[PDB]
Design an enzyme around this catalytic site. Sequence first.
Site, PDB file in Angstrom:
ATOM      1  N   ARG D  59       0.824  -1.215   0.000  1.00  0.00           N
ATOM      2  CA  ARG D  59       0.000   0.000   0.000  1.00  0.00           C
ATOM      3  C   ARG D  59       0.857   1.263   0.000  1.00  0.00           C
ATOM      4  O   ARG D  59       0.469   2.274  -0.599  1.00  0.00           O
ATOM      5  CB  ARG D  59      -1.014   0.027   1.154  1.00  0.00           C
ATOM      6  N   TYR D 112     -15.447  15.099 -16.905  1.00  0.00           N
ATOM      7  CA  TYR D 112     -15.931  13.730 -16.783  1.00  0.00           C
ATOM      8  C   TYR D 112     -17.061  13.661 -15.767  1.00  0.00           C
ATOM      9  O   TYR D 112     -16.981  14.255 -14.686  1.00  0.00           O
ATOM     10  CB  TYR D 112     -14.768  12.868 -16.297  1.00  0.00           C
ATOM     11  N   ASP D 184      -6.562  17.217 -15.864  1.00  0.00           N
ATOM     12  CA  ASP D 184      -6.824  15.836 -16.243  1.00  0.00           C
ATOM     13  C   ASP D 184      -6.442  15.688 -17.714  1.00  0.00           C
ATOM     14  O   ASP D 184      -7.124  16.217 -18.599  1.00  0.00           O
ATOM     15  CB  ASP D 184      -8.297  15.519 -16.001  1.00  0.00           C
ATOM     16  N   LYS D 209      -7.654   4.509 -19.956  1.00  0.00           N
ATOM     17  CA  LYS D 209      -7.848   4.902 -21.361  1.00  0.00           C
ATOM     18  C   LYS D 209      -6.577   4.665 -22.129  1.00  0.00           C
ATOM     19  O   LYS D 209      -6.109   3.538 -22.160  1.00  0.00           O
ATOM     20  CB  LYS D 209      -8.406   6.320 -21.416  1.00  0.00           C
TER      21      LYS D 209
END
Lengths: 396, 396, 396, 396
Positions: D59, D112, D184, D209
């Site tokens: 983590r 988005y 972004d 993407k």
Amino acid sequence: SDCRTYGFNTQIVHAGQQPDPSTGALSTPIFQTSTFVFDSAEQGAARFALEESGYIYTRLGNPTTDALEKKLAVLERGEAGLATASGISAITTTLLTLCQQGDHIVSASAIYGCTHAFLSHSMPKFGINVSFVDAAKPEEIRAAMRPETKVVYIETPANPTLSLVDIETVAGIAHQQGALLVVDNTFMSPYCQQPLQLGADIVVHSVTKYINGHGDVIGGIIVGKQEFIDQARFVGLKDITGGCMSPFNAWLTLRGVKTLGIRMERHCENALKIARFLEGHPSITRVYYPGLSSHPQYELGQRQMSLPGGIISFEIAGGLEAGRRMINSVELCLLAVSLGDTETLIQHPASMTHSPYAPEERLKAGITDGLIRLSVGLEDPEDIINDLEHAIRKAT
Amino acid sequence: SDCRTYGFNTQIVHAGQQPDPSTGALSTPIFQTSTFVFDSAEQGAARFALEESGYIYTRLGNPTTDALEKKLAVLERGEAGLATASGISAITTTLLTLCQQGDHIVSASAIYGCTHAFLSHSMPKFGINVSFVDAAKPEEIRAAMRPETKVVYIETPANPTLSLVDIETVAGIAHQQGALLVVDNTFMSPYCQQPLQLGADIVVHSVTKYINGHGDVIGGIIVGKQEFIDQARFVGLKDITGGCMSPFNAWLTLRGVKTLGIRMERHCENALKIARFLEGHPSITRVYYPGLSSHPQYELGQRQMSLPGGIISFEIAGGLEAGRRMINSVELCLLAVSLGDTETLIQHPASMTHSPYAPEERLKAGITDGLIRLSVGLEDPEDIINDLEHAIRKAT
Amino acid sequence: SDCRTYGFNTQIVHAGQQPDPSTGALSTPIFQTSTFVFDSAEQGAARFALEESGYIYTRLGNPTTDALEKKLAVLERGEAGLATASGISAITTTLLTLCQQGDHIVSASAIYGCTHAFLSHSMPKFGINVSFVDAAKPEEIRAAMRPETKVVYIETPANPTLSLVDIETVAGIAHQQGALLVVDNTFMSPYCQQPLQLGADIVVHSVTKYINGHGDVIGGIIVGKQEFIDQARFVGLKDITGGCMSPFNAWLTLRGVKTLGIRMERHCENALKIARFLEGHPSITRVYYPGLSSHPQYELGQRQMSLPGGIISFEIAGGLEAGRRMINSVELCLLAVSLGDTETLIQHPASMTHSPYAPEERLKAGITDGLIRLSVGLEDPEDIINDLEHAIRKAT
Amino acid sequence: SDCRTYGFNTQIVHAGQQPDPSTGALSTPIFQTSTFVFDSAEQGAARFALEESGYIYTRLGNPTTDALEKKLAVLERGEAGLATASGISAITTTLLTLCQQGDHIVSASAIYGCTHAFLSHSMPKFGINVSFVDAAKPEEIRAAMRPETKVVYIETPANPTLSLVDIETVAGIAHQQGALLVVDNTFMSPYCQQPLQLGADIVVHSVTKYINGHGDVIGGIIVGKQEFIDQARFVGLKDITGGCMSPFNAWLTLRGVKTLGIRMERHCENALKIARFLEGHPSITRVYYPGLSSHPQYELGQRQMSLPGGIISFEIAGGLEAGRRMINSVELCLLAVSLGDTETLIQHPASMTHSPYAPEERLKAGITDGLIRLSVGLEDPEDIINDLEHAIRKAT
Ligand SMILES: *Cc1c(COP(=O)(O)O)cnc(C)c1O
Ligand SMILES: *Cc1c(COP(=O)(O)O)cnc(C)c1O
Ligand SMILES: *Cc1c(COP(=O)(O)O)cnc(C)c1O
Ligand SMILES: *Cc1c(COP(=O)(O)O)cnc(C)c1O
């Protein structure tokens, strides 16, 4: 320290493995690579000349697969291991390394079906002849030996009736006549049987079964002396079968084998309960299980096997149609042809794998019309028994 | 519709694949399973009798691997495909299915080294004899044919000097004499050469190279007629080599092949630039590349190959010591023995793979002391050229 | 049938899973996809309107992860599950779904360190206040409740001293005052403790520990009522944390959890043996383990937990320097900070995780200078005991 | 050498990666582990004190994920990277690290949809207010700035009409008023646009993407200054979102990004051809594509973007019913809601994602009844055009 010194459960967890040296990662990294890079021309040459340890190319060897090979060598008390694409590839890489045209093999008749097909139909086309014998009768092995015999090949227990072969006695016969003994130890795993400790020269497994145990890997392993394994690696695998194991499959098998001891304990505890239930059921004519004292080779099994296994075969009253009805009536057991998974698997060969065969041809694989084969999983045994009772009651 | 109707890039992306029927998942699911479950005894029997489509057990077949097999069959314009554990397993599964003791093979001498070892040392021990010829001279193939010849075996281009074989001419010779032609198409991929369209009967690849393209899979593929592939699957793979491909490896190869067209275009654009740079360099005595018009079979290459490939070999002035110095002086090219990866890879066989061999034995593999083999990657060609220029300048 | 009806081991193996409907594959396929494809505009709209079951996009839901969610819901006796990127993400997705600025949480002080950091430092910066109490004293929970309290948050057993919290009593207090009870059940797994059956509303786990059990997955799970889980999925995960689990991680966790019952049995059998060994060792001042009758809440543990767990803490004579010497002297136990793996792991917080902290600040996490934390693995307990004895003897 | 010195394609292949130091493995090993092991108490303490490099727990950090983080930092010309469980997690880990109750964000409205939901509904519940503006008008950004504004947040190009935002101009406005600019960059990838080079402070991507590009990974990445990334890692990820990326997902993204340059070149070559076809089609009322000179911000796009992208939106004659008929008539394009995959994907929002919304509410996301969104894949553009022509002709 040396992992060959620890207890067997400790070895299952730790043998062949250690934290990654550059990062400390505890899980063996997945070295999912084909290519390895040399720091210099001299380092490449040193590896190709076997003058330096290290890797070259994954078909030849890989760090993830090496960990699995070393672990299984420790567990079988052998010198070295070689992982393969499948159990079949473990068997054929072994035998095609050892044998050439003009050589001979004495094989048990009670062996895995595709191994039998390889030995019956493919080996003779390469000039390698095979004599099949009842390996429960060691005298038949001796009588079949020829000057050209290189290998005696056995499986124990042998599906589908779970008959046994006396490994130590057969090893002595094979060695006196100058042959190697190869044992397929898939059914038992090294947790339950150690053929090399009883005199076998080479052990093969389908890791697809208990060693991986999770029903998600096809793979094999070969364990034996370093001198033989080196030939199996650099000739049999490299040149003949090409049957190398994917690093990801080796990693999954390393992961599956971590629980081999606890899985085998539960498989066998469950199987003994189910076998006793079936032996008390008046609709079941016969139960084949090494843990039942009525097994014809019971005492041999107690000396040779630390647990009686997770596989049971049994005959249902009413033959073919009853077996078909029973298998179509289970709700928890799953209809399938593999074994050694965490789920209980069931099959009825006479209506499934051997349906378009004559009844006299089916017995040639020990298959009677009512014979059912059960691979006992890790579910609650009461649930498995209830499912079997429900299906048997409906079928009969 | 039918994917066999679309353009080649569309087929690269889509052939053999479609959204998962039960969920719509676009990526082919990784069916990382050994076991398949039947809904009834009758469904199991129907599959074993080949009376119903569907799966049984991953060594026999698997949905993920089936997608790769179908895609590569489309790309090679063949009927059917069979995925394997390695390129070697594709070659040996093919030849051990086709040949038995007493049969004969005519093989090119300029072939992959481990294939040569299989044919030279392992095949004759199974009673299968092999005659090696210069396959750039089709008359030598004809002259070596015997009544027992089952297979003519060729690679084109052939490492390490990138000589060619006229597939169409050799196919006609093989067929007139009753033999099959097997072509190892690894070097080119189906994007650049289609041996079945030129008359070959069977194509094999190491998908380890360009088809996967990402340096992280060992695997092979066989493409040919359905009747042959069925024998390669249910006898050669099932029984003889056991060389099945892991579903995860098939999924990675499906993923790698999605970019095969764009990768081959860039590999070959880069390689032509680098080859022209090397041909103009006064410290480089020779450059072997099908895209240079001085290549001895240049016109054949233009008819048979849509692009000249991503591999270059070249000879550096000063022989063995210069080649060693050059390869120890690159900073971007990586020293390794594979090819077809996204990274540029370089090797100097005389100081790496063939160092403990006599110079006259090294030529038997076409290897001169100054020969360097380059697998051109996807980096900026200016960076590759600068690295080569820096290393050549230092070495000479 | 309904899997919620079978025994717990049967559910561990089977719940949430079944053979793939299109192929029969037994292993849950790895749906390693982002994209899902609709057959029509109407099918897409139906899914987006929740008027049709099926998948859209892996962040929202995925077939592999759905199987894990359903299995863990069955095992915890909850309605629904939600898998996450980490145990921390399970905790924060839960609490950030439930709480907004002005809300309050009563939390145990004896909680996982990073959870404590989230609650102490991050929650108040979002206007969400937290009161920490000794949750072994349910009256302190009651006294800390405010009109704005939405959640009472507890862990039991609580590292590093393995103190307990009475789930049923705390649930009654929380509910009387209008709050939900969230229990982190990581330490026990559903095989050993079932907080929802004792009145908790929501259970969270780090699957990184026992549920996966193989030291190769970071992940979490949330289990609770469908109405809450739907909000945690479509608001907390979708919008706030984005902490979705990878399908491959879900598949590995499904695979690891197959052996949860047999693993927990062996972990706890081994831990009880080791705990008794440590309690008899004159160089060990204290042993913290729920299976020892001297544990201050022993009887509560017997009512609430079916097994005493796989974790032990103990204090070595000689404080900080002895603890450092001991941990530097083990040869089999591995120095690490996770728990619940198949390998035995060991840590000495005062010299490792909390070294640059004052002794009075270390006690604020219950850490004394000689405290050692042991995660007992699946090795032979005799080997673990021998390793501990060797290291303790050297250290003291 | 330093990889920050090579050409961009060379960096795509090599940055952040090198052969494994202990084995030479070329592919980055998959360090699929949770646990890391320390050699001593002192080594553990040194890592926890940041006094020694190395790993502790996945983590917090992992070697496979570190390679991806370093590569993407190189490609965006940023100091450091942080991989996440999803694009959403990259966005929210960033903003929840930077903002606390009382802070303010100015965001573009054309963002988005799930980012918009986070900003509209979740942020204000944590006391963090958001003003939405038309970011194509930089004066609206300036006018919305407040003393409490910490962040200006933009996407460019912005779906679904592919409008642009002038990064350099907005960065200057944000900085003059004391705020950070977060961009972004998912749509473009670093191959086509580099916001940090134009003054942005932080770049986020959904690697789902183009960066991964193969439709089989959900993931995100954050790139920025070391000081910020360290806070995003050790507070935002560790404590708040828990949104860590699985090592296997990082390895797949490393593998996908190897072909980013060649993929983007082909996506954009194909998209320009398809966009020109659509602009000439009399049944298509509008085509939104930055590569068409009629795009309202065409010249800005030419200065800010090296290629016009792989995404096209267009309006079909006849509104809602024509769009539904068209999307139900494609045979090659696949109906789905993601983008950036190797397959061409198509969606009609008014009949799919936004069907149960009022037409005036749909425009609030820029959605007209006839609007179709196309993610152009790697197929032959002639096949895509033929499919679109067939479907358009049927629909109109
Ligand atoms: C399944 C099995 C094999 C074959 O192994 P594969 O992995 O399927 O190739 C060989 N021997 C036995 C006893 C088996 O059960
Ligand atoms: C690498 C290669 C092979 C062998 O394939 P493997 O996947 O390594 O077994 C065979 N032929 C050619 C031309 C090759 O380059
Ligand atoms: C390890 C742990 C966590 C955190 O889970 P991660 O998967 O590391 O994010 C939470 N609670 C407990 C009790 C833990 O042991
Ligand atoms: C898909 C997308 C996202 C969200 O990323 P996920 O990986 O789905 O969480 C964010 N921004 C843009 C521009 C996207 O296309």
